[PDB]
Amino acid sequence: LGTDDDFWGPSGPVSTEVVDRERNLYRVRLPMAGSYHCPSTGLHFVVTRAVTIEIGFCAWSQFLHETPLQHSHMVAGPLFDIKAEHGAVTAVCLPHFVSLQEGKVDSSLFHVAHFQDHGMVLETPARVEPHFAVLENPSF
Amino acid sequence: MEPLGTDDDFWGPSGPVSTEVVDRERNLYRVRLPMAGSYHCPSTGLHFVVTRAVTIEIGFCAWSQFLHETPLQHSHMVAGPLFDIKAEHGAVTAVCLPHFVSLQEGKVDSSLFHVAHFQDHGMVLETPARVEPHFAVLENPSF
C-alpha cells in the first residue's frame, strides 16, 4: 500500500499489500505472465500466469549459525520467506550486496540457501548477476 | 569422587558454597549463602557481601531488550554482563558486578562507569561506590 514498494511489471506498476505490518509479511498479485521487478527489495519474479506471491522478511540469525557446515558461508543478501503456487514461477532473482565489478569475487562461490524442515539446502544459482542471483523453477 | 568446590561455586568464609542450577536452558541459578561474609563466584565474577544467611537468585540476561528504550542510552556501551538478581530486602550489603574494561592503561576515566538497573519505570544509572580493575561495587542494592 505504498508507491515505494511497487513492482514494475509489463502492464505498469503493481502495488505490494501489507499482510502483517509487525511481522513484515507482504503480498503482491501479479496480474499476468511476464517479468516483475521490485526496486525496493531487489527481488525479481518471472511468472507464466497471474499468481499471488507472498513475501516475508526474515533474519538469517534464526537459521544460519556458526556450525562446522555453515561457518564458511557468509550472508550475501537478505533472507525472504516466499510462497507461490508451483508451476507459476519461471525464476526468482534474489538480491545480493556483493560487488562483482572488480574481478575479486568468483561467481561459482555463490549459493542460494533454502531452509526447509529437514535443514539447509544449498542451491547453485542458474546465473549470478551484478546485484542478484537467479534461481530457476523454484519450489518455495 | 567429585571436587569439593568448582569455579561455578560461591567461595565464602566457610569455604565453597554450591550453586544450584534452576533451569540450565534459561540459565537460572540460585545459591544459599550460609552466613555473614563476602562471597565470590569465579565463573561469573559476581561478589556478594551479606550480613546473614540469604538465598540469592541469579539469571543470565542479554542487554538487547533493555538497552533500546530511550535515546540517551546510545551514548553508553555495554561494559559487563547483565544479571537478574533477586534477594531478601535486607541481607545484601554490597554486590560486585563484573566488567571487562581495562583500567591499567589509565585511558579510561573511573567516573564514566555506571550500574544500570532496569526497573519497571525505566532505567536507573547509579554511581558505583567503587570501581576496581574488574568489577564495580554497588552498596545497599535493592533488587
Place this chain on the structure above:
Amino acid sequence: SPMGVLLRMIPAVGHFIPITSITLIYYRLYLEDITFHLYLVPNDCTIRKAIDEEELKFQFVRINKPPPVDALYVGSRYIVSSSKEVEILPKELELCYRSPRESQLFSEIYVGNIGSGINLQLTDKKYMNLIWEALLKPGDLR
C-alpha cells in the same frame, strides 16, 4: 520456505569483502534544533526496514540521499564529519553486517538550528579520502 544468497569464504579473504553499501539518514526536529542519525550498512532491504521501524519509534524519519557510489569493504572504518560546528557521537563508523534483529550502529549528530543547511561527510579513516557526502537543507525535511 526462507531463501537468500550466501557467499563461500576463502581463507585469504574472510568476512572483509567489497560490498554495495547504503547510507541511511534520519532526522528529528525538536524545538528549533535538529538531530541526525547516520547509518552505513550493506544494501539489504531487511536491514533498512528494521532501522526504519526502530527509528520511527523515536520519531526519527528517513531523508533520501544517494548512497556511496564506490564499493566499500566490510570492516573498513569511516570518519563522520560536518561543515557546521556540530557534536558527533561516535565520530567513527564501521561497515559490517548485523542481523536485522540486532540494533544497528549509527552516528548521532546534534546540529542545533539547521540555518542554510548542513554538509555531512564520510571519510575513509585509513587514507582520509572523501567517499560520500550529502547537503541537508531546510527543504529536505518536508
Place this chain on the structure above:
Amino acid sequence: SPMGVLLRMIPAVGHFIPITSITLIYYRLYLEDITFHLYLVPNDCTIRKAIDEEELKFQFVRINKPPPVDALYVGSRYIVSSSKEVEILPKELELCYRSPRESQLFSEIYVGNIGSGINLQLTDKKYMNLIWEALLKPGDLRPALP
C-alpha cells in the same frame, strides 16, 4: 532486578576502547586430524556460556589456555597463524562485543596431523607483534565432559 555495568562513551573515542579479552579454544578430533575453533571475545560469562552451549551441540570440547596478557582494543584486528600445514578460515579476527544471543565469530583451524602439537598464534595486524600464543598438544585433548 536486571543490573550490569555500562560505560559512558566520549565522542573522540567511541566504542573502540581497551578491554580484558579472553581466548576460547574448542576442538574435535576425528582420527589423526583435528579441528580447532578459536574465539577472541570480551571477558563476559554470558558470552562464554553461549559459545560453550553452541559448541557442545557439535561435540566440540573446550581446551583451557591462559588468555592474552595485555588489554586489547575493541575494533582492533588480529591475525591467526600457525605452522605451514594448517588451514585457517578466516585468518583475521576482530575483537568486538556481540550480544550473547548473536552468533560469535571464531577462526576454524584444521590440521591433518597433530604430531607433537600445534603452535597457535594471534598477532596484532597493525604492527605485527605477537600478543598471544598457545601450544596445543595431544595431552591437552581430554574427553568430552569436564
